[PDB]
Design an enzyme around this catalytic site. Structure first.
Site, PDB file in Angstrom:
ATOM      1  N   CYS A   4      -3.053 -21.390  40.496  1.00 32.85           N
ATOM      2  CA  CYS A   4      -4.487 -21.184  40.411  1.00 32.85           C
ATOM      3  C   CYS A   4      -5.284 -21.514  41.670  1.00 32.85           C
ATOM      4  O   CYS A   4      -6.255 -20.828  41.985  1.00 32.85           O
ATOM      5  CB  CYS A   4      -5.042 -21.945  39.198  1.00 32.85           C
ATOM      6  SG  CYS A   4      -4.374 -21.183  37.696  1.00 32.85           S
ATOM      7  N   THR A   5      -4.884 -22.572  42.349  1.00 31.49           N
ATOM      8  CA  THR A   5      -5.452 -22.903  43.626  1.00 31.49           C
ATOM      9  C   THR A   5      -5.300 -21.698  44.567  1.00 31.49           C
ATOM     10  O   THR A   5      -6.275 -21.267  45.149  1.00 31.49           O
ATOM     11  CB  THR A   5      -4.823 -24.208  44.213  1.00 31.49           C
ATOM     12  OG1 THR A   5      -5.147 -25.322  43.379  1.00 31.49           O
ATOM     13  CG2 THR A   5      -5.325 -24.491  45.612  1.00 31.49           C
ATOM     14  N   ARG A  26      14.576 -25.678  74.891  1.00 28.77           N
ATOM     15  CA  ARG A  26      15.442 -26.828  74.532  1.00 28.77           C
ATOM     16  C   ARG A  26      16.960 -26.517  74.349  1.00 28.77           C
ATOM     17  O   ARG A  26      17.763 -27.436  74.072  1.00 28.77           O
ATOM     18  CB  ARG A  26      14.882 -27.509  73.293  1.00 28.77           C
ATOM     19  CG  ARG A  26      14.828 -26.589  72.101  1.00 28.77           C
ATOM     20  CD  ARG A  26      14.217 -27.225  70.875  1.00 28.77           C
ATOM     21  NE  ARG A  26      14.606 -26.494  69.671  1.00 28.77           N
ATOM     22  CZ  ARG A  26      14.142 -25.299  69.297  1.00 28.77           C
ATOM     23  NH1 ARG A  26      13.216 -24.660  70.002  1.00 28.77           N
ATOM     24  NH2 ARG A  26      14.588 -24.748  68.174  1.00 28.77           N
ATOM     25  N   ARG A  35       7.561 -24.001  70.440  1.00 28.48           N
ATOM     26  CA  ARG A  35       7.994 -25.114  69.587  1.00 28.48           C
ATOM     27  C   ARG A  35       7.646 -26.452  70.177  1.00 28.48           C
ATOM     28  O   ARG A  35       7.354 -27.393  69.439  1.00 28.48           O
ATOM     29  CB  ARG A  35       9.495 -25.042  69.329  1.00 28.48           C
ATOM     30  CG  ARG A  35       9.901 -24.092  68.216  1.00 28.48           C
ATOM     31  CD  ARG A  35       9.387 -22.674  68.401  1.00 28.48           C
ATOM     32  NE  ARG A  35      10.058 -21.767  67.494  1.00 28.48           N
ATOM     33  CZ  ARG A  35       9.680 -20.528  67.224  1.00 28.48           C
ATOM     34  NH1 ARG A  35       8.620 -19.972  67.793  1.00 28.48           N
ATOM     35  NH2 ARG A  35      10.380 -19.828  66.351  1.00 28.48           N
ATOM     36  N   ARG A  50      -4.574 -18.385  43.924  1.00 29.73           N
ATOM     37  CA  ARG A  50      -5.128 -17.144  43.425  1.00 29.73           C
ATOM     38  C   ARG A  50      -6.653 -17.121  43.405  1.00 29.73           C
ATOM     39  O   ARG A  50      -7.221 -16.091  43.716  1.00 29.73           O
ATOM     40  CB  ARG A  50      -4.574 -16.827  42.009  1.00 29.73           C
ATOM     41  CG  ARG A  50      -5.052 -15.511  41.384  1.00 29.73           C
ATOM     42  CD  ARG A  50      -4.189 -15.033  40.211  1.00 29.73           C
ATOM     43  NE  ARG A  50      -4.038 -16.109  39.221  1.00 29.73           N
ATOM     44  CZ  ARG A  50      -2.939 -16.852  38.992  1.00 29.73           C
ATOM     45  NH1 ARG A  50      -1.786 -16.641  39.650  1.00 29.73           N
ATOM     46  NH2 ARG A  50      -2.993 -17.821  38.057  1.00 29.73           N
ATOM     47  N   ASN A  95      -6.396 -23.158  35.188  1.00 32.90           N
ATOM     48  CA  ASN A  95      -5.330 -24.145  35.333  1.00 32.90           C
ATOM     49  C   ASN A  95      -3.969 -23.538  35.015  1.00 32.90           C
ATOM     50  O   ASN A  95      -3.866 -22.477  34.369  1.00 32.90           O
ATOM     51  CB  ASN A  95      -5.619 -25.327  34.399  1.00 32.90           C
ATOM     52  CG  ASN A  95      -6.774 -26.172  34.878  1.00 32.90           C
ATOM     53  OD1 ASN A  95      -7.926 -25.924  34.523  1.00 32.90           O
ATOM     54  ND2 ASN A  95      -6.481 -27.148  35.724  1.00 32.90           N
ATOM     55  N   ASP A  96      -2.923 -24.206  35.494  1.00 38.39           N
ATOM     56  CA  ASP A  96      -1.559 -23.749  35.261  1.00 38.39           C
ATOM     57  C   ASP A  96      -1.170 -24.095  33.801  1.00 38.39           C
ATOM     58  O   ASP A  96      -0.388 -23.368  33.198  1.00 38.39           O
ATOM     59  CB  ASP A  96      -0.597 -24.301  36.342  1.00 38.39           C
ATOM     60  CG  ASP A  96      -0.954 -23.816  37.783  1.00 38.39           C
ATOM     61  OD1 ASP A  96      -2.133 -23.589  38.121  1.00 38.39           O
ATOM     62  OD2 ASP A  96      -0.043 -23.672  38.613  1.00 38.39           O
ATOM     63  N   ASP A 113      19.912 -26.254  61.171  1.00 43.69           N
ATOM     64  CA  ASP A 113      18.466 -26.179  61.102  1.00 43.69           C
ATOM     65  C   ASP A 113      17.967 -26.034  59.680  1.00 43.69           C
ATOM     66  O   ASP A 113      16.788 -25.713  59.502  1.00 43.69           O
ATOM     67  CB  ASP A 113      17.953 -24.997  61.943  1.00 43.69           C
ATOM     68  CG  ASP A 113      18.309 -23.631  61.359  1.00 43.69           C
ATOM     69  OD1 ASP A 113      19.006 -23.503  60.301  1.00 43.69           O
ATOM     70  OD2 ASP A 113      17.917 -22.650  62.024  1.00 43.69           O
TER      71      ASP A 113
HETATM   72  N1  LIG Z   1      18.192 -26.353  65.626  1.00 45.73           N
HETATM   73  S1  LIG Z   1      18.074 -24.817  66.044  1.00 45.73           S
HETATM   74  O1  LIG Z   1      18.250 -24.725  67.468  1.00 45.73           O
HETATM   75  O2  LIG Z   1      16.806 -24.271  65.636  1.00 45.73           O
HETATM   76  O3  LIG Z   1      19.128 -24.022  65.283  1.00 45.73           O
HETATM   77  C1  LIG Z   1      20.501 -24.344  65.154  1.00 45.73           C
HETATM   78  C2  LIG Z   1      20.961 -23.238  64.218  1.00 45.73           C
HETATM   79  C3  LIG Z   1      22.418 -23.358  63.841  1.00 45.73           C
HETATM   80  C4  LIG Z   1      22.826 -21.966  63.409  1.00 45.73           C
HETATM   81  N2  LIG Z   1      22.963 -21.855  61.931  1.00 45.73           N
HETATM   82  C5  LIG Z   1      21.987 -22.106  61.028  1.00 45.73           C
HETATM   83  C6  LIG Z   1      22.466 -21.873  59.750  1.00 45.73           C
HETATM   84  C7  LIG Z   1      23.825 -21.470  59.870  1.00 45.73           C
HETATM   85  C8  LIG Z   1      24.960 -21.064  58.974  1.00 45.73           C
HETATM   86  N3  LIG Z   1      24.952 -20.977  57.604  1.00 45.73           N
HETATM   87  C9  LIG Z   1      23.813 -21.277  56.726  1.00 45.73           C
HETATM   88  C10 LIG Z   1      22.761 -20.153  56.569  1.00 45.73           C
HETATM   89  C11 LIG Z   1      22.070 -20.292  55.191  1.00 45.73           C
HETATM   90  C12 LIG Z   1      23.124 -21.017  54.393  1.00 45.73           C
HETATM   91  C13 LIG Z   1      23.220 -21.165  53.008  1.00 45.73           C
HETATM   92  C14 LIG Z   1      24.313 -21.868  52.496  1.00 45.73           C
HETATM   93  C15 LIG Z   1      25.288 -22.403  53.354  1.00 45.73           C
HETATM   94  C16 LIG Z   1      25.224 -22.263  54.748  1.00 45.73           C
HETATM   95  C17 LIG Z   1      24.148 -21.567  55.296  1.00 45.73           C
HETATM   96  N4  LIG Z   1      26.116 -20.739  59.614  1.00 45.73           N
HETATM   97  C18 LIG Z   1      26.289 -20.761  60.959  1.00 45.73           C
HETATM   98  N5  LIG Z   1      25.322 -21.120  61.805  1.00 45.73           N
HETATM   99  C19 LIG Z   1      24.104 -21.471  61.325  1.00 45.73           C
HETATM  100  C20 LIG Z   1      21.749 -21.006  63.936  1.00 45.73           C
HETATM  101  C21 LIG Z   1      20.784 -21.823  64.760  1.00 45.73           C
HETATM  102  O4  LIG Z   1      21.109 -21.729  66.148  1.00 45.73           O
END
Ligand SMILES: *NS(=O)(=O)OC[C@@H]1C[C@@H](n2ccc3c(N[C@H]4CCc5ccccc54)ncnc32)C[C@@H]1O
Ligand SMILES: [Cl-]
Ligand SMILES: [Cl-]
Ligand SMILES: [Cl-]
Ligand SMILES: [Cl-]
Ligand SMILES: [Cl-]
Ligand SMILES: [Cl-]
Ligand SMILES: [Cl-]
Ligand SMILES: [Cl-]
EC number: 6.2.1.45
Lengths: 1007, 76
Positions: A591-592, A472, A12, A594, A772-773, A535
Site C-alpha cells: 500500500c505504501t 578495484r 562504485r 501503490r 492497509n495490507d 557478490d
Molecule cells: N565482488 S564483485 O567484484 O562485484 O564480483 C565478484 C563476482 C564473482 C562472480 N560470481 C558471482 C556469482 C557467481 C556464481 N554463481 C552464483 C550465481 C547465482 C547463484 C545462485 C545459486 C548458487 C550460485 C550462484 N558462479 C560463478 N561466479 C560467480 C562474478 C563477479 O565477478
C-alpha cells in the site's frame, strides 16, 4: 577544464566516498617513499582511487627477495631501481593519475610540492623523524608504515589542524515526527526509531507551528529512548501543531595530531585486536628497538631465526622500558617471547600482512586528502602470530628458514622451506574473479600457491569485465573490457609470477545446481580447500552446502564500502556460513508503494516496476501469446492476475505505433494517466480534508496528500519521462528514434504535444483503494478474450523486450526510472533525486573500493596459513570484522559446530554423516542401522518424497523392502534417477535403543 | 553496572546489566534499543563471539567493557 568526475569509471567508489571527497583527492599530490611490497600496495590502491598525482621514490636496486610481495617486480628487473621499474605499471592502473619518479631526496625541501607524504619500511627512523618534522611544521600530512614478518604498524600525523567533514560515511538518519513538546521532547511517529546517539545534530522541515525550527538551524540531540529525543526548549519558536521530518547533519570536527617524535615517547594507540591490546605497547618498543639495532649494525635488521640478535633486541627493548616505564606502565615486564619473535621475523615479507597494511594505509591517505572518515589517531600495531604452524610439523630454526635464492625467501624466513612447499602443492578452488578474486589471485601468485607439481588453482567466474570494475579489479585494463574475468586474471598473475604458468585453470562456468555435471564429485574431492570471492548470498550458501558435503575448508569474505568481514569454515570443527542468519532485505508494504509513498525509495521502486511492465513484461506476454496456441487457456487457470495480462496484450496490439511521433504521444498520455488521472482518482476517494472513524485527518504521518501534475516540458522530469518513454516504446515496436543518433530536442517534442487532445479526467465511483495490507482487495474476461486479435493476423510480429542495463547511459533506462520516480515525487511533495542516486537504488549497487578489498583479502590469506597446517585448535582461527571508516578492527574465534548424541555415540550435527557404499536395498539399510548404529529407522526420505516409514502396513512394506534405493525412488517419485547422479542424500528419523526419537546425521548413498 | 555496545557504523549503545546476566538477556536489551532480533546479532568481546546461554561473567566482561555488534557483508 576539470572539477567533474568520471561516473563510468568511479561509479562504485563514488558511492563510498562521495563527490566532494573525490574532488579534494583530485587536487592532492601524494608521495610514497619505498616501493617494496608495502609501498607498491599502498600506491596501487591510491592510484586506483584517483588522486591528482602519485610520486614514488625508491632508488634501491631490485633484488630477487623483493619479489616476495612486490607484484610489479620481475626477475628481469634485478639490478635496476625499484622506483623506475614500478612507475610504468602503476600508471597503467589509472590513466587519470600521472605517476612520477623522484630521483633523489637529498633536499627535504622537495617535500613541499606534496600534500600527503607516506614513509614505508625502506625509511630509517632517523629519516622518518626528520621528514615528519618537516611535514608537520609545513602543513604536509604524514603517514608511515612498516611490516616485519607477521607484525606490522602504521602511524598517522595530519598536523595541528585537521578537519573531519564526516566521521563515518553513513546515510544521515532521518524520520517522521508526531509531536514536539515545549521542552524540546521530539516523539517519533508510531513505532519508528530515530536511531540517533546523544550529541548528534539534526535539522527539521515541515514542522507546522514552529516556523523557524525549519530554517536549517541544527539542534543537539539528547536521546531519551528508542522513540524520543530532546532538542532543548522550543517554546521560543511557537507551539507544535502537526507534521515534521528530522534530518541528521554531520558537523565538522577539528582535531590535532602530534609529531612522530612526541608520539614515540608518548603514543596514542588504536587497537587492531582487543584480544591483543597488551601487545600494543610491547610492539611499540619492539619496532623502535629494530631501528636502534639497525643503527648499531650498519642498517641491517636482526638475522632470521637468530638467538644472539634476539637477545640483543630484548636488551634494547628492556632499556627503553627501564628508561621510560610509561609506554608499558608501572611494574609491567617486557614480553620477552613476543620481542624474540619480532627479532626472528624482522626480515619477513608476508603477503597477507602487506595487503592488510596496504589497504589500511591507502585508505588513511584518502582520509588525509579529503576529511572523509575518521583518521587513525595515531599509532596501530598488528600481529598474526596464530598463522605460525606447529613447530612439531614444520620446525623453525636458522637452517630451515635460510634463503634458498628464490623470490619466496622472505616468506621462507618466517615459515620454513618445507611449509612453503606445502603451500605450493596445495589444490584450491576460487569462486569468483572480481574484486576479492583479483586480490586473492595476486596474493596467491605471491605465495606460490599451486605452483608445485602436486598443486593447482581452479578459478571460475561467469562475468565479463565491465568498465566500472577497473576501479578495484586491478588485474584488468581498459582494453580487457568485454573479455572474461577469470581468463584475464589468470593470465595477468602469471606475468606477475611465472611459477604459475599452466597451473591456473580459468573457467567461465556459473557455480550452482545447473553446473554439477562439471563441478562434480571428483572435482571437489580432489581439492584441499575452497575460497569464496562472491557478490551474493545465495552463491555463498550454495558453496557452503558443498563444502559441508565434501568436507572441505572454506575461506569466506565480503565487503560493503569500508566495511568488511572474513569467516573460516573448518570441517569437523566450526559452524558453517549457513549456520547463522544475517538481517534480511526489508520489504516496503504494498500500500505504501501503490498509493502512499513518502520516500524517494518508494517512488523509485514504483517507477522500476512500471518500467518492467511497460517495456519488458508486456512484450514477453505479447510474444508468448503469438507463439503459444494454448496461452490464453494457460493464463486463465494459472495466474493470480489474469485481467492484467490480457489487458496488457489487448493494449499492446490495439495502440500499435507507426512512427516515433506516435511513441511521443503514447508517452504524453501515460504522463497524464500516472501523474494526473490516477492522482485525481485517489483524491476522489480520499479528499485532502478526509477523516477516519476517530475523526482525525486521513492524510497525516506517512500519508502525504498528492497534487496532480500539469505537464510542463520545461520541467526536466516531465521532459525526460516523455523522451525516455517514447524512446523505449519505439525500441519495443522496432521503430527508429529521432533520438538514436543525437540529443532530444525540446521544441520538437513540444510541437507534437502542443497539437494533442489530452482527454479530461472523469472519476470512477466504484474503485475501492486498499489502505492497509490487512484490509481486503476489491465476466468481462470473456469480452477481453473476444477482443484479442488472431495471432495469424500478426505473422512474424515480435516485440523486442527491454533487458534492464543500469550501466549504459545511452539506453534511456535510468533516464526513465529517474524521471518517472521524480514525477511521482513531485506528486507527493518528495525531494527529487538525480540519476546517480536513482541508479544506486533501482540498480541495487553495492558501494565498493579497492582499499577494503585488499585488506579483507589480506586477512583471508593470514587464515589460509592455518589450513595448510591442519589446525584443529579452534582458538587459533580468527573471523574478522572491519570498518576502515572508523577505523575499526575486531576478531573472534569461530563458533564450534553443535554436537549431538544418540545412544553412547557423540556426533557433529553439521559435518558427520552415514556413508553407505552401494545402491543398497531398503531392508539392508534398515538392518544396518539397528545392527551397527543402535538406531531404528522411523522415516526415510529423499528430498520431498517419503520412501519408508515404520507405520507402513505389511502390503506396502512388501513392495519396498527388497528394492535398491534408486528403484525405491523410482517407485514413489515415478522419476528415474538421472545417469549423472552419483550420490543421494537421505534424511532419516530414528528411535534409539530406549525407543525414544533422537536427532541423527543424514545419509549419503554412494552409487 | 554499565557496559557499552559499539556497532559497525560507529554507534554507541549503553546498557544496564549485572555480571550474572545471560547473553540471551544482553541481546534482549539490544533488541529493545535497536530493534535487531537476537538471532541476527553477532556480539564479539576480547576475541570471542558471545554465545546464547552463557553469561557475561563467563567472558570476563567488567564494568565499562565495550562489546562490538558486527555484520557479514555480501559484496566482493
Ligand atoms: N565482488 S564483485 O567484484 O562485484 O564480483 C565478484 C563476482 C564473482 C562472480 N560470481 C558471482 C556469482 C557467481 C556464481 N554463481 C552464483 C550465481 C547465482 C547463484 C545462485 C545459486 C548458487 C550460485 C550462484 N558462479 C560463478 N561466479 C560467480 C562474478 C563477479 O565477478
Ligand atoms: Cl558529497
Ligand atoms: Cl575542490
Ligand atoms: Cl617508463
Ligand atoms: Cl630499516
Ligand atoms: Cl541481490
Ligand atoms: Cl533487475
Ligand atoms: Cl554494460
Ligand atoms: Cl547515495
Amino acid at each position: 577544464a576539470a572539477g567533474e568526475i568520471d561516473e563510468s569509471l568511479y561509479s562504485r567508489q563514488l558511492y563510498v566516498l562521495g563527490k566532494e571527497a573525490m574532488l579534494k583527492m583530485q587536487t592532492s599530490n601524494v608521495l610514497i617513499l619505498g616501493l617494496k611490497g608495502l609501498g607498491v600496495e599502498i600506491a596501487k590502491n591510491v592510484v586506483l582511487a584517483g588522486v591528482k598525482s602519485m610520486t614514488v621514490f625508491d632508488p634501491e636496486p631490485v633484488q630477487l627477495a623483493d619479489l616476495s610481495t612486490q607484484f610489479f617486480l620481475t626477475e628481469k628487473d634485478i639490478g635496476q631501481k625499484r622506483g623506475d621499474v614500478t612507475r610504468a605499471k602503476l600508471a597503467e592502473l589509472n590513466a587519470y593519475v600521472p605517476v612520477n619518479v623522484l630521483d633523489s631526496l637529498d633536499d627535504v625541501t622537495q617535500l613541499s610540492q606534496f600534500q600527503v607524504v607516506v614513509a614505508t619500511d625502506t625509511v630509517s627512523l632517523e629519516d622518518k623523524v626528520k621528514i615528519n618534522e618537516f611535514c608537520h611544521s609545513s602543513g604536509i600530512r604524514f603517514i608511515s608504515s612498516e611490516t616485519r614478518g607477521l607484525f606490522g604498524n602504521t602511524f598517522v600525523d595530519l598536523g595541528d589542524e585537521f578537519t573531519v567533514l564526516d566521521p563515518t560515511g553513513e546515510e544521515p538518519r532521518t524520520g517522521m515526527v508526531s509531536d514536539i513538546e515545549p521542552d524540546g521532547t521530539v516523539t517519533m511517529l508510531d513505532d519508528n526509531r530515530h536511531g540517533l546517539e546523544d550529541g548528534n545534530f539534526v535539522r527539521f522541515s515541515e514542522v507546522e507551528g514552529l516556523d523557524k525550527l525549519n530554517d536549517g538551524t541544527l539542534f543537539k540531540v539528547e536521546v531519551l529512548g528508542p522513540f524520543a529525543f530532546r532538542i532543548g526548549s522550543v517554546k521560543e519558536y511557537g507551539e507544535y501543531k502537526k507534521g515534521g521530518i528530522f534530518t541528521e547533519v554531520k558537523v565538522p570536527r577539528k582535531i590535532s595530531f602530534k609529531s612522530l617524535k612526541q608520539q614515540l615517547s608518548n603514543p596514542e594507540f588504536v587497537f587492531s585486536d582487543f584480544a591483543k591490546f597488551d601487545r600494543a605497547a610491547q610492539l611499540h618498543l619492539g619496532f623502535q628497538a629494530l631501528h636502534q639495532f639497525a643503527v648499531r649494525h650498519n642498517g641491517e635488521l636482526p638475522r632470521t631465526m637468530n638467538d644472539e640478535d634476539a637477545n640483543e633486541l630484548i636488551k634494547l627493548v628492556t632499556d627503553l622500558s627501564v628508561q621510560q616505564p610509561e609506554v608499558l606502565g608501572e611494574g609491567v615486564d617486557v614480553n620477552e617471547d613476543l620481542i624474540k619473535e619480532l627479532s626472528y621475523q624482522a626480515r619477513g615479507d608476508i603477503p597477507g600482512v602487506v595487503a592488510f597494511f596496504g589497504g589500511l594505509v591507502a585508505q588513511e591517505v584518502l582520509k588525509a586528502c579529503s576529511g572523509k572518515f575518521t583518521p587513525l589517531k595515531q599509532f596501530m600495531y598488528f600481529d598474526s602470530l596464530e598463522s605460525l604452524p606447529d613447530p612439531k610439523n614444520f620446525p623453525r630454526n636458522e637452517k630451515t628458514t635460510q634463503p634458498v635464492n628464490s623470490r619466496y625467501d622472505n616468506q621462507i624466513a618466517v615459515f620454513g622451506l618445507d611449509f612453503q612447499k606445502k603451500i605450493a602443492n596445495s589444490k584450491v578452488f576460487l569462486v569468483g574473479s572480481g574484486a576479492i578474486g583479483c586480490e586473492m589471485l595476486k596474493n596467491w601468485a605471491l605465495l606460490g600457491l599451486g605452483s608445485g607439481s602436486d598443486g593447482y588453482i581452479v578459478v571460475t567466474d561467469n562475468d565479463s569485465i565491465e568498465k566500472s570494475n577497473l576501479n578495484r579489479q586491478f588485474l584488468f585494463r581498459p582494453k580487457d573490457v568485454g573479455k572474461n574475468k577469470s581468463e584475464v586474471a589468470a593470465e595477468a598473475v602469471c606475468a606477475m609470477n611465472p611459477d604459475l604458468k599452466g597451473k591456473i585453470n580459468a573457467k567461465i562456468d556459473k557455480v550452482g545446481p545447473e553446473t554439477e555435471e562439471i563441478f562434480n564429485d571428483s572435482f571437489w574431492e580432489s581439492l584441499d580447500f575452497v575460497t569464496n570471492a562472491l557478490d551474493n548470498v545465495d552463491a555463498r550458501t550454495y558453496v557452503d552446502r558443498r563444502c559441508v558435503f565434501y568436507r572441505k575448508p572454506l575461506l569466506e569474505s565480503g565487503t560493503l564500502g569500508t566495511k568488511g568481514n572474513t569467516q573460516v569454515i573448518i570441517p569437523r570443527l566450526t559452524e558453517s556460513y549457513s549456520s547463522s542468519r544475517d538481517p534480511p532485505e526489508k520489504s516496503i508494504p504494498l500500500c505504501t508503494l501503490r498509493s502512499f509513498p513518502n520516500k524517494i525509495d518508494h517512488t523509485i521502486a514504483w517507477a522500476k516496476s512500471l518500467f518492467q511492465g511497460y517495456f519488458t513484461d508486456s512484450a514477453e506476454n505479447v510474444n508468448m501469446y503469438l507463439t503459444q496456441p494454448n496461452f490464453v487457456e494457460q493464463t486463465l487457470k494459472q495466474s493470480g492476475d489474469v485481467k492484467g495480462v490480457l489487458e496488457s496484450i489487448s493494449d499492446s496490439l490495439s495502440s500499435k505505433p507507426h512512427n516515433f511521433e506516435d511513441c511521443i504521444k503514447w508517452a504524453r498520455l501515460e504522463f497524464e494517466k500516472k501523474f494526473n488521472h490516477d492522482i485525481k482518482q485517489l483524491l476522489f476517494n480520499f479528499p485532502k480534508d478526509a477523516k477516519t472513524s476517530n475523526g482525525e485527518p486521513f492524510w497525516s504521518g506517512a500519508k502525504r496528500a498528492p497534487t496532480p501534475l500539469e505537464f510542463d516540458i520545461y520541467n526536466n522530469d516531465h521532459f525526460h519521462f516523455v523522451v525516455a518513454g517514447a524512446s523505449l516504446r519505439a525500441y519495443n515496436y522496432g521503430i527508429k528514434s529521432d533520438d538514436s543518433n543525437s540529443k532530444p530536442n525540446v521544441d520538437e517534442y513540444k510541437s507534437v504535444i502542443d497539437h494533442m487532445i489530452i482527454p479530461e479526467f472523469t472519476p470512477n465511483a466504484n474503485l475501492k483503494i486498499q489502505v492497509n495490507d490487512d484490509d481486503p482487495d476489491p465476466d468481462e474476461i470473456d469480452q477481453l478474450v473476444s477482443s484479442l486479435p488472431d495471432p495469424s493476423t500478426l505473422a512474424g510480429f515480435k516485440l523486442e523486450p527491454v533487458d534492464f542495463e543500469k550501466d549504459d547511459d545511452t539506453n534511456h533506462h535510468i533516464e526513465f526510472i529517474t524521471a518517472c520516480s521524480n514525477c511521482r515525487a513531485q506528486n507527493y511533495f518528495i525531494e527529487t533525486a538525480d540519476r546517480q542516486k536513482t541508479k544506486f537504488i533501482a540498480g541495487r549497487i553495492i558501494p565498493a573500493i579497492a582499499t577494503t578489498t585488499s585488506l579483507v583479502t589480506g586477512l583471508v590469506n593470514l587464515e589460509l596459513y592455518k589450513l595448510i597446517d591442519n589446525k584443529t585448535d579452534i582458538e587459533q582461527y580468527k573471523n574478522g570484522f572491519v570498518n576502515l571508516a572508523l577505523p575499526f578492527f575486531g576478531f573472534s574465534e569461530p563458533i564450534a559446530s553443535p554436537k549431538g548424541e544418540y545412544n553412547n555415540k557423540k556426533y557433529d550435527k553439521i559435518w558427520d554423516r552415514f556413508d553407505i557404499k552401494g545402491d543398497i536395498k531398503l531392508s539392508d539399510l534398515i538392518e544396518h542401522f539397528e545392527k551397527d548404529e543402535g538406531l531404528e529407522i522411523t522415516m526415510l526420505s529423499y528430498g520431498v518424497s517419503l520412501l519408508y516409514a515404520s507405520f507402513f502396513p505389511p502390503k506396502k512394506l512388501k513392495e519396498r523392502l527388497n528394492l535398491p534405493i534408486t528403484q525405491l525412488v523410482k517407485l514413489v517419485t515415478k522419476k528415474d534417477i538421472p545417469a549423472h547422479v552419483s550420490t543421494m542424500i537421505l534424511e532419516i528419523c530414528a528411535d534409539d535403543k530406549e525407543g525414544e526419537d533422537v536427532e541423527v546425521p543424514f545419509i549419503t548413498i554412494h552409487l | 553496572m554499565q557496559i557499552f555496545v559499539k556497532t559497525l557504523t560507529g554507534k554507541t549503545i549503553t546498557l544496564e546489566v549485572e555480571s550474572s546476566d545471560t547473553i540471551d538477556n544482553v541481546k534482549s536489551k539490544i533488541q529493545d534499543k535497536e530493534g535487531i532480533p537476537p538471532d541476527q546479532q553477532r556480539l564479539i568481546f576480547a576475541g570471542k563471539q558471545l554465545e546464547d546461554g552463557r553469561t557475561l561473567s563467563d567472558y570476563n566482561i567488567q564494568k565499562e567493557s565495550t562489546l562490538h555488534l558486527v555484520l557479514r557483508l555480501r559484496g566482493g
